[PDB]
C-alpha cells in the first residue's frame, strides 16, 4: 500500500566524537536530498517529500570494537567512531527497488560522511527495514504543505 | 509475559522543546497507557513495566527543507514527533487497535497546542516485539508485587 | 543446527544499544558499562570455538533520556518509604540471521549476566526496570562503508 510508504524515517546513531569535524545536519539535509531522488520503474518518487525524514542522534557513551588496542597496536590513535543508519520504508516494493534506493542513499552517504574517513578509524553501517507495524496513524499539520491546490 | 514489556519511544525534532513541555507529554502518554484494557477486565500494559523515553534529535532534516512553508506564508521551519510503542505478542487485533486509539487519542490532546505554532509532522505506531530473548533484571516490579 | 558462516555477511553488524532514563547518569558511568558489554559479547562462542560477535562489527552505544515517565510516578515507592525516583534502562542487541537457537540462548545468557553485574550498583540506590531482548535483524539491503574493518 501507498499509505505503508508514507512515513520513510532515517534516523542516524552514531559516536559522539564525530561531531568535531562534520555538520551533521548537514549530513541529514543530503540524505534527505538522495531519499527525495529515488525513481521506480515508472518514474514514480519512491518517498514522498511530505512524509521524508531524517534524524541523527549522537551517543555520549560507547565502545566499538576492541576499544583501541589495535588502533594503538598499528602506530594510530585507537579513537575509533562509528555511524550507524536505519532506513525504515513501507512493505510492498520489490527487492530491486529496495535496493535501488539502498544504492543511491548509501552513494551519497558514502559522499557526504567522506571526510570522516580521513579523521579517524569509523565503522560506517547503513540497513533498510520494512516496517511490520500492527497500528499507524498520522495527525500532524505537516502534510498540508504538500495537498494539491491552483491558485 | 512477553508483555510485560511495555515500552514507548519517542523521537522529535529539537526544535519542539521551545512550545512543548515533553515531561509533561511523557507522562500524559504513560498515563493513558496504564487506561488500555482488555475484554477480560484486565489492565493491557502492567504498571511496574510501562515505561515512556523521548529524545530531541539535535541534527534533523524534514520534507523538503522548508520551501512549501514559506509558499504559504510560513517560515518553513518544520517540526517532527515520531512515537513508537512496542508491545509484546500474543494479543488480539482488537486489542492491539484499542491500544493504538486510546494512545492516539492521548497525543492528539497532549499535542494539539504545539500545532498553533509550528508545522509538525506527528506520527505514531505500533511494533509487536518478536525478540528471540528476553530478560528482565531489575527491581523496580518488586514494588508492583 | 547454526549456519553463521553460510551467513556471514549478516554477521558482521551486531549491535546493542541501551536507552534508559537520563537520571542513572547520576549513578554510574554509563561509559564502563558499555565498556563492559563489549567485553561481553567479544566471550560468546559458537560450537566450534568460534567468536559469534567479530571483533570489528561489535559495537554498544547508550542514550540517556532528558524526558522520560516511568510506572505510576513515583506512588508506589513514596508509599513503600522510598524517593519514587524511578530509572529504567532498555537493551536490545540486534543481531544476524541463521543462527541456531542454542547460540541465539548462550550470547543472551552471556550478555544478560554482564549486564546484571555492570548494573548491580544502580539498584542498591534506586528502583530500576531493566530489560534486555535480542532481536534478529530482518533487513532487505545493507552496506558498509567504514574503514574500520581495516584493523581485524
Redesign the interface.
Known amino acids: 500500500n501507498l499509505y505503508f510508504q508514507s ?1 520513510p ?1 532515517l ?3 552514531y ?1 559522539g566524537n564525530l561531531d568535531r569535524d562534520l555538520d ?2 548537514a ?3 543530503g ?2 536530498d538522495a531519499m ?1 531522488t529515488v525513481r521506480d520503474d515508472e518514474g514514480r518518487q519512491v518517498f514522498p ?19 583501541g588496542q ?2 594503538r597496536d ?1 602506530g594510530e590513535s585507537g579513537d ?1 567512531g ?3 543508519l536505519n532506513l525504515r520504508m513501507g512493505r510492498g516494493r520489490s ?1 530491486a527497488v ?2 535501488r ?2 544504492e543511491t542513499i ?1 552513494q551519497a ?2 559522499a557526504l ?1 567522506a571526510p570522516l ?1 580521513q579523521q579517524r ?26 495537498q494539491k491546490g491552483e491558485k
Do not use: W
Not at 517529500?49 to 576499544?67: E, K, M, N, Q, S
Not at 520494512?130 to 500532524?140: I, T
Open positions: 512515513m524515517h534516523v542516524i546513531l559516536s551533521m545536519g549530513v541529514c539535509r540524505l534527505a527525495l517529500t511530505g512524509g521524508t525524514r531524517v534524524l541523527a542522534y549522537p551517543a555520549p557513551h560507547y565502545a566499538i570494537a576492541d576499544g589495535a588502533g598499528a575509533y562509528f555511524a550507524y527487492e529496495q535496493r534506493a539502498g548509501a552517504a558514502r560522511l574517513l578509524r569509523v565503522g560506517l553501517t547503513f540497513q533498510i527495514d520494512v516496517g511490520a507495524e500492527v497500528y499507524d496513524a498520522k495527525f500532524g499539520n505537516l502534510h498540508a504543505l504538500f
